[PDB]
């Protein structure tokens, strides 16, 4: 009598930036959906394809937990069939997605007097991200016809940024910790039901 | 929306002077914003980026601060060749827009000069056609700023009248006005007394000048 | 040779459509962040439009539904579909390279712009004559015309000192005007002629005005 183990997402203690996010495969296990409804910040509980008072009578096969952190003004994107930078460049959820995005702010975690330039973004990219696609490369974009080679200057510039979250930002600048919750039943037994 | 207000609208400095504009968002965008110049007749140019990163290629004494709401622009030792007009802009991605801010013009700064007013009747020309086009010249005055006000028979006219500015004179650092009254023949002939007052920095009490229709 | 040129602008009817094109090189259009930026005159600068890289668009309020951006990569030109155009969309027209946190570091020259009901017309040149009563004041009335621009010589050049030929205004009928002053001794007004040389090329009008103190 396994139990999901959704506390080690949500309740984690650094989350991992939005171009390089991370993903716990979750199957084999008892999941408790009645931990996350209605909690304190909870300022995005969008479900998409999938209803929330019916996930405990539903079994997947896998139930993959996203987390990564973005900021205020961003969180609209995570969501299936939206664009921008976080959508095209950083996490891109498919058209037919069919799970749940939650988030909240969290400033008094994520922000440093000073600037947390800890978490980062991606800002040039030649493509869009294809659905669930995590991209690390770090390699030097080349914005012009000259090749690059690995010299940062113009026309050839590093394809990370910095959020540097300060809590004095307004609060669509400010951090917010995103969990996307992706319900899967595909060719597969189901294993993670509901209790 | 974001609204970017920017003030001065206008400012006057000589060579040397340390030279400060201001930017302010309606909401926070913490570092978001960008500084450029532009002279007429060109495209604008960046100066700085990310509030307060110097773009390559431009001189030191250009530098940008602030974060959040409030930005400054500035110029510590102002250069000839940096009298134009400067813009900040939110280059952030939401709220879409990337508004610019109504921009500062740093003109010449020279001693005060009072305009020399001339008022001109219709050319009978004209008159003929049925459009009476009254003109005041403001010659050669300093600062920009001057208020002109005309008068038909003592009675303040607003809505019929357009005014043009010369660019500031590449020799003596003046500027020029015209405005020009339109009426219509008929309601041309139904008064006598035209006038333009000029109210100016350089002149101790408002000057006007007038002519009276068929003398 | 990194640089943006502009082509396409021009006059045209409200309504109408007008395709504006951005010719790029050093800078590869479909690896950027690509802006169309526009100025009223007289205005500030007012963004139009965005596609990225991965090509994402956006649009302005005031243009959506009816500008179009777009860019062939073989090409490495960038494209503004402009229709149902307005009066309000009268501007020099900018594209350039946005770097986003980086600022907009690549502009071009600007492209011309001007959507109006009017029909050419040439100008009616009026005196501005010195008045009766050490320096008067003269000039020439170029007034109602389309579309711009007018030049304006004294004496075929011979007169530069003291000229000020302002600016057009666009009036309410459409039509633009203007006025050239020029400031002279008032012991020259009879001893010396003034003519104002008013040259408007898309009327094909050249006219030569005489400016004399007028006779009660």
New interface residues.
Partial sequence: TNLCPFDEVFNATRFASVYAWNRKRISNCVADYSVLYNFAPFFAFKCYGVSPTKLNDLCFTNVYADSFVIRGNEVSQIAPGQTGNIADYNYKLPDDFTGCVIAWNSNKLDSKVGGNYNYLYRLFRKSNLKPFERDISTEIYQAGNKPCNGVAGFNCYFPLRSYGFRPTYGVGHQPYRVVVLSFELLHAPATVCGK | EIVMTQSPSSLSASVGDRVTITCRASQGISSYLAWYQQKPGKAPKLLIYAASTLQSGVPSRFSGSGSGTDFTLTISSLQPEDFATYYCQQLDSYPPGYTFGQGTKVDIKRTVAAPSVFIFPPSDEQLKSGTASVVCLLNNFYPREAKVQWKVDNALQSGNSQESVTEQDSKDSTYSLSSTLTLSKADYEKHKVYACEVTHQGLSSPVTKSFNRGE | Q?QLVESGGGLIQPGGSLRLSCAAS???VS??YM?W?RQAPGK????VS?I?????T?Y?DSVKGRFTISRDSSMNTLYLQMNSLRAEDTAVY?CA?????????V????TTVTVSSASTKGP?V????P?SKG?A?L?C?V?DYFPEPVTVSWNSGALTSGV?T????L?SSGLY???S?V?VPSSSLGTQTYICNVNHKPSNTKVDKKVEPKS?
């Fill in positions: 990194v050093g800078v590869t690896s950027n802006s930026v500030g600068l007012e963004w965005i990225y890289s991965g090509g994402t956006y302005a900018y390279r946005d770097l986003m946190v980086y600022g907009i570091d502009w071009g020259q600007g009616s009026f005196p501005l004559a008045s320096t004041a000039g009335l007034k000020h302002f600016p057009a205004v009036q005007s203007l006025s002053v400031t009660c």
